[PDB]
């Protein structure tokens, strides 16, 4: 539900989130470019076909509000989309 | 209480001295209460028998390396009680693939199974310990506020005091701020999370190499990181 549906609406793919890692704004600010207001839960799925890691960064539980979507290719290059 | 606690959770006895002192904390009683009220209206992972499987692979004295995690994987079948570890019939999640990647880089002579079940390491003295021991199926960080971390902290604190010369691998700021071991008595190694979002590729982490170089100086044998 919710979160995974978002990944599909954004990528089209039906990906299953495999882990959710908690990161602080400074750890994130470093990569996304922007600094979130609070702690970020990075939900990561892996699209084996394209061999990309699809990461849906939301806010912490229990809110889980979508903040940015990040697609990283096999060569570590990111495609960031602020939601 | 220890006999009953140990009963419910199937905790190994070697861990009695580090855990027992914590039951007597009123905040622990409430933690257990909150845990039990939850299993009644929510699917909690991992299964009750696995919540403390980390106390079963080696004794507190056999411990050599302590790796800290956050909460358990929330999709059923994944988690089995150890940080980062996944049951053998489950594909290694993204962070685990990077951890396993950093291992092969340090030790290229290693024959990896391609699998992600870390119970081999646990048996060797690597304590893969999360600070939040349970999670509701499908909700991440759902039990992160019920008090598991104050508890786990209490046990690590005792472990560190009882056995000098432990190596600690703290990945990500969260883990670094959570556990603050004495750095004059123990080897505290810090790094960015193994997550793929991290600015620095984890495959460049040499903690497994430094950990062993350290164990060499204290006359303890190195851990075989291959898995």
């Amino acid at each position: 539900t919710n979160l995974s549906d978002i990944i599909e609406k954004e990528t089209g793919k039906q990906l299953v989130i495999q882990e959710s890692i908690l990161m602080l704004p400074e750890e994130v600010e470093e990569v996304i470019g922007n600094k979130p207001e609070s702690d970020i839960l990075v939900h990561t799925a892996y699209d084996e076909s394209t061999d990309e890691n699809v990461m849906l960064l939301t806010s912490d539980a229990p809110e889980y509000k979508p903040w940015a979507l990040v697609i990283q290719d096999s060569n570590g290059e990111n495609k960031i989309k602020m939601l | 209480d220890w006999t009953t606690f140990r009963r419910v959770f199937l905790i190994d006895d070697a861990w009695r001295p580090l855990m027992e002192p914590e039951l007597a904390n009123p905040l622990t009683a409430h933690l257990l209460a909150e845990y039990n009220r939850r299993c009644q209206t929510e699917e909690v992972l991992p299964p009750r028998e696995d919540v403390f499987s980390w106390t079963r692979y080696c004794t507190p004295d056999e411990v050599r390396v302590v790796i800290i995690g956050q909460d358990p994987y929330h999709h059923p079948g994944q988690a089995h009680g150890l940080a980062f570890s996944v049951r053998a019939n489950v594909p290694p999640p993204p962070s685990l693939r990077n951890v396993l990647a950093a291992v092969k880089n340090c030790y290229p002579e290693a024959r990896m199974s391609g699998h992600g079940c870390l119970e081999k390491w646990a048996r060797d003295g690597v304590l893969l310990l999360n600070t939040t021991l349970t999670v509701k199926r499908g909700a991440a960080a759902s039990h992160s506020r019920i008090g598991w971390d104050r508890f786990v902290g209490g046990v690590i604190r005792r472990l560190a005091a009882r056995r000098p010369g432990l190596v600690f691998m703290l990945w990500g700021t969260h883990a670094q701020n959570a556990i603050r071991p004495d750095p004059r008595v123990h080897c505290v190694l810090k790094f960015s999370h193994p997550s793929p979002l991290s600015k620095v590729p984890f495959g460049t982490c040499q903690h497994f190499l430094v950990a062993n170089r350290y164990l060499e100086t204290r006359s303890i044998s190195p851990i075989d990181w291959s898995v």
Side-chain angles (χ1 to χ4, degrees):
Chain A
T1 28
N2 311 19
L3 304 176
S4 256
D5 282 348
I6 306 187
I7 291 182
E8 184 167 25
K9 148 66 194 179
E10 303 293 332
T11 70
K13 286 296 301 73
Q14 326 75 26
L15 302 179
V16 164
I17 291 164
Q18 288 186 269
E19 61 183 33
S20 302
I21 302 315
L22 185 80
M23 297 198 159
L24 287 143
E26 295 67 48
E27 286 182 293
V28 170
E29 178 193 7
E30 206 159 79
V31 188
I32 296 324
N34 310 278
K35 189 174 164 304
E37 81 150 81
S38 70
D39 315 296
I40 289 294
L41 274 179
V42 181
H43 301 87
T44 316
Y46 167 71
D47 181 354
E48 175 68 81
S49 65
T50 49
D51 188 1
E52 306 167 311
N53 282 300
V54 188
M55 299 146 284
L56 188 254
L57 326 192
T58 67
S59 63
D60 198 15
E63 195 187 75
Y64 306 117
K65 178 175 177 174
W67 177 65
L69 181 72
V70 175
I71 311 292
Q72 178 183 109
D73 54 35
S74 306
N75 76 270
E77 189 202 297
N78 295 338
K79 303 85 167 198
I80 309 169
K81 183 195 184 301
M82 304 289 312
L83 315 169
Chain B
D1 220 0
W2 169 258
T3 302
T4 24
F5 183 63
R6 174 211 53 168
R7 179 179 299 142
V8 184
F9 291 114
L10 239 43
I11 307 184
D12 184 289
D13 266 320
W15 292 80
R16 184 187 199 146
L18 306 166
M19 313 203 55
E20 176 167 41
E22 291 287 330
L23 301 184
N25 189 327
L27 292 208
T28 297
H30 305 328
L31 160 68
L32 273 312
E34 195 43 49
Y35 164 70
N36 299 289
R37 264 61 279 151
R38 280 180 202 259
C39 299
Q40 294 181 53
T41 40
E42 57 197 50
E43 162 161 34
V44 178
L45 275 12
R48 179 191 293 332
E49 321 86 66
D50 293 328
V51 180
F52 283 93
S53 72
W54 50 268
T55 68
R56 301 184 205 131
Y57 300 94
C58 73
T59 59
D61 292 331
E62 285 174 57
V63 175
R64 297 188 284 176
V65 183
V66 177
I67 303 172
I68 299 294
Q70 296 171 3
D71 63 343
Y73 288 114
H74 54 81
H75 170 280
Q78 300 187 282
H80 61 111
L82 300 188
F84 303 103
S85 195
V86 294
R87 312 202 97 112
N89 57 187
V90 163
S95 280
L96 189 56
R97 277 191 293 93
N98 283 198
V99 162
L100 300 191
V103 170
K104 190 54 172 282
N105 285 323
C106 297
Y107 298 102
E109 326 278 289
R111 70 304 180 287
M112 310 298 296
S113 74
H115 281 77
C117 191
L118 311 181
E119 59 182 38
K120 174 180 175 291
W121 290 7
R123 310 203 120 102
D124 273 27
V126 179
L127 184 64
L128 297 150
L129 177 46
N130 287 328
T131 49
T132 300
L133 301 188
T134 65
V135 67
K136 170 189 191 151
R137 180 217 175 144
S142 35
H143 294 185
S144 56
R145 284 161 230 103
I146 68 194
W148 273 123
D149 65 339
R150 189 226 90 253
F151 177 79
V152 165
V155 174
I156 291 165
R157 196 191 65 255
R158 302 208 176 69
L159 179 67
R162 161 184 192 112
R163 182 136 271 79
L166 299 180
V167 178
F168 285 82
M169 299 181 184
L170 304 167
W171 304 328
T173 304
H174 181 87
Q176 295 169 16
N177 297 344
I179 305 300
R180 317 298 253 300
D182 192 334
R184 307 166 304 181
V185 184
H186 303 104
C187 190
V188 187
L189 301 170
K190 299 187 165 186
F191 204 75
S192 39
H193 200 279
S195 165
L197 190 68
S198 285
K199 210 267 293 173
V200 193
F202 199 79
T204 65
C205 186
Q206 298 210 278
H207 284 192
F208 313 93
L209 193 27
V210 182
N212 280 344
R213 286 186 174 165
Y214 174 87
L215 292 177
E216 245 74 299
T217 70
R218 292 201 78 129
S219 291
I220 293 160
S221 45
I223 297 170
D224 167 37
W225 290 106
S226 64
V227 91

